[PDB]
Amino acid sequence: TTYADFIASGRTGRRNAIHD
Amino acid sequence: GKDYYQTLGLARGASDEEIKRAYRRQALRYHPDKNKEPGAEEKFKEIAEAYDVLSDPRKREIFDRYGEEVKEFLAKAKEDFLKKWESPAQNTAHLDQFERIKTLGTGSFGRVMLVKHKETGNHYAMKILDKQKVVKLKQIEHTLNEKRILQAVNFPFLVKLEFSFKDNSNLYMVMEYVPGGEMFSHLRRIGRFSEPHARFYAAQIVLTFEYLHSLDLIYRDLKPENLLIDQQGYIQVTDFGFAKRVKGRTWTLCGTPEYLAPEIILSKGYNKAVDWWALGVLIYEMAAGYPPFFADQPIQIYEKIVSGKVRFPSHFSSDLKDLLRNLLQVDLTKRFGNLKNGVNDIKNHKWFATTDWIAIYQRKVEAPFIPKFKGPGDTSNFDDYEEEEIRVSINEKCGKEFSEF
Numbered sequence: 001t002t003y004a005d006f007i008a009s010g011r012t013g014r015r016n017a018i019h020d
Numbered sequence: 021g022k023d024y025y026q027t028l029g030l031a032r033g034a035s036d037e038e039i040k041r042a043y044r045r046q047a048l049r050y051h052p053d054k055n056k057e058p059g060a061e062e063k064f065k066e067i068a069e070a071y072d073v074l075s076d077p078r079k080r081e082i083f084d085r086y087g088e089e090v091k092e093f094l095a096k097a098k099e100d101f102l103k104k105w106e107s108p109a110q111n112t113a114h115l116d117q118f119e120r121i122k123t124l125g126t127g128s129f130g131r132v133m134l135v136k137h138k139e140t141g142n143h144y145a146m147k148i149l150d151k152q153k154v155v156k157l158k159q160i161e162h163t164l165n166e167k168r169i170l171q172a173v174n175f176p177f178l179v180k181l182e183f184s185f186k187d188n189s190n191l192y193m194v195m196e197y198v199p200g201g202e203m204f205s206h207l208r209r210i211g212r213f214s215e216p217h218a219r220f221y222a223a224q225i226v227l228t229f230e231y232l233h234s235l236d237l238i239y240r241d242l243k244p245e246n247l248l249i250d251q252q253g254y255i256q257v258t259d260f261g262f263a264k265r266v267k268g269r270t271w272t273l274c275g276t277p278e279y280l281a282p283e284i285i286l287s288k289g290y291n292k293a294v295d296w297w298a299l300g301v302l303i304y305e306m307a308a309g310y311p312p313f314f315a316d317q318p319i320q321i322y323e324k325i326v327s328g329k330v331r332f333p334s335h336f337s338s339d340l341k342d343l344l345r346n347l348l349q350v351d352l353t354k355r356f357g358n359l360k361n362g363v364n365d366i367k368n369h370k371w372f373a374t375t376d377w378i379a380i381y382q383r384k385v386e387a388p389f390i391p392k393f394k395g396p397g398d399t400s401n402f403d404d405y406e407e408e409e410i411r412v413s414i415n416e417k418c419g420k421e422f423s424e425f
């Protein structure tokens with residue numbers, strides 16, 4: 001569900017990491 | 021994995037007449053004519069299963085044997101880890117020895133490059149990190165843990181750290197060069213992994229997490245970007261930037277938003293259970309082709325995660341949804357891998373009953389997908405990157421905060 005929403009989210013490429 | 025003695029509630033090496041006494045006891049507790057709570061019926065068959073084995077003296081023989089062997093494998097693994105843990109490898113090479121070819125990927129830490137050692141003639145993969153982008157993060161710590169841990173661990177699915185050294189501008193980690201590409205690229209290209217396809221990958225992670233947890237190590241950054249496919253089509257975990265050795269609870273907020281377990285997002289502390297949460301996300305993203313929790317921006321991903329409302333696609337078997345429902349559990353007293361039966365709850369799940377655990381470890385199962393090997397040192401299962409030359413300054417930067425390397 002919402003695969004086209006996944007593409008619209010802009011978070012489909014290699015995701016960077018949080019480090020806090 | 022099955023733990024027959026715990027089902028009956030007895031110590032190993034109990035007397036066969038206490039095995040009989042234990043069985044008739046637990047059998048009365050979960051009897052269908054006596055207890056009707058929905059879980060009792062399957063603990064009843066599991067109590068019968070434990071007795072069928074422990075009373076047949078030749079089957080208690082095979083089971084007691086496979087157990088001491090596990091005890092020795094865990095004790096020899098732990099032995100290997102601690103000696104290399106406290107006696108780590110340093111300055112085992114120098115950049116002059118390696119000829120740089122192609123950038124295989126680029127990350128916030130630094131670059132990973134295909135290199136050929138000139139003497140040995142072998143190909144390796146070098147991770148270059150700039151001490152000046154990392155002394156700023158204040159996560160010198162996370163990169164020190166990555167060196168100490170990667171040297172000192174051994175498993176068919178962890179990548180092997182052959183050489184490590186440092187110069188004035190950077191730190192270097194040379195590693196076995198996995199050529200099949202990142203799972204990330206394959207998954208995105210296809211869009212989806214088939215359920216049997218995902219199960220294969222999932223199983224090696226359960227085995228790796230079992231290993232790594234047995235050593236009191238949390239891995240803390242499971243994602244397809246961090247999983248590489250070797251030539252036998254199997255999995256090489258390749259990024260340990262966030263792995264820490266932990267007793268009790270730890271508190272750093274780190275890893276990758278989509279894969280952060282709820283308890284990390286909340287100021288509450290956390291432990292190895294977060295890697296089991298991540299596995300559920302990993303299985304989900306492989307089967308669906310998208311993670312269970314996205315949004316334009318991390319804060320709204322954190323919000324979707326803590327809600328614990330998941331939606332599954334129309335495909336997705338019933339056992340898949342039951343497994344993720346147990347992995348993606350906000351309740352730490354209900355999430356598989358954290359319960360009394362530990363990894364067995366995952367190993368013995370209905371979505372896995374078709375998977376030969378030992379054959380996975382010995383890599384004797386045929387892999388649902390083998391990459392096209394094009395000859396030693398091909399880089400075409402990797403994307404092409406803009407090549408930035410290595411600069412070393414006249415002066416050694418951050419010589420102190422990276423004393424241990």
Ligand SMILES: NCCNC(=O)C1=CN(c2ncnc3[nH]ccc23)CCS1
Pocket residue numbers: 124125126127132145179195196197198199245246248258259402
């Ligand atoms: N999110 C950061 C995690 N990414 C990585 O570690 C990468 C490693 N790459 C490797 N390619 C081939 N062989 C290899 N051996 C060890 C690493 C390695 C590809 C580039 S990205």
